[PDB]
Amino acid sequence: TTDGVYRVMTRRLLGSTQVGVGVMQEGVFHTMWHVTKGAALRSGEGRLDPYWGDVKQDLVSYCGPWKLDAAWDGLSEVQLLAVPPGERAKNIQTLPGIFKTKDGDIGAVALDYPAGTSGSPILDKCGRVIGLYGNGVVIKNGSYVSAITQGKRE
Amino acid sequence: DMYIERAGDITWEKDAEVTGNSPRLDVALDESGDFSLVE
């Protein structure tokens, strides 16, 4: 339960397949809903049970409520701490674009990584998590542009 | 049964590989949390 970024793995398929990524912060595990699909997780001898989740926001928290509250300022560059399947965690600095929707504008990272990278945190200059990578759109050139998905803190 | 293994710390790293463009896309989000390009 130490704070940090974690791989989300499964043994249901061939070998150990990485289905996604998530953030442990303040005893709560945060990830994209499509990674676990709300299922319980294992952390050595311990077990993480879901606490909050939403399919539209595509988010889910384990052990407690969503703790991440920081946001992109619309101006500065961010870093995607990408954790790719079978590959070492690595920070990729980019300047986000905009997903323009009827309910508002959202930041967007135009980096392409395998779908098992879903749940990797997007960071600001203070190392604060401003969102999760993994939910976006496929553009004209086949590549992926993911939204900067952040939940609510109560 | 899904499981988790630590992959690293969450810190900002100066002198990182800077790449990627900043596109402005008109999108729509359905009840299933799936984005789609509006053109």
Ligand SMILES: O=C(Nc1ccc2c(c1)CNC2)c1cc(Cl)nc2[nH]ccc12
């Ligand atoms: O499929 C992806 N993401 C996803 C999947 C299922 C659902 C949602 C998002 C939200 N509603 C359920 C994905 C993620 C990433 Cl990082 N690269 C990719 N390239 C192609 C696809 C894709």
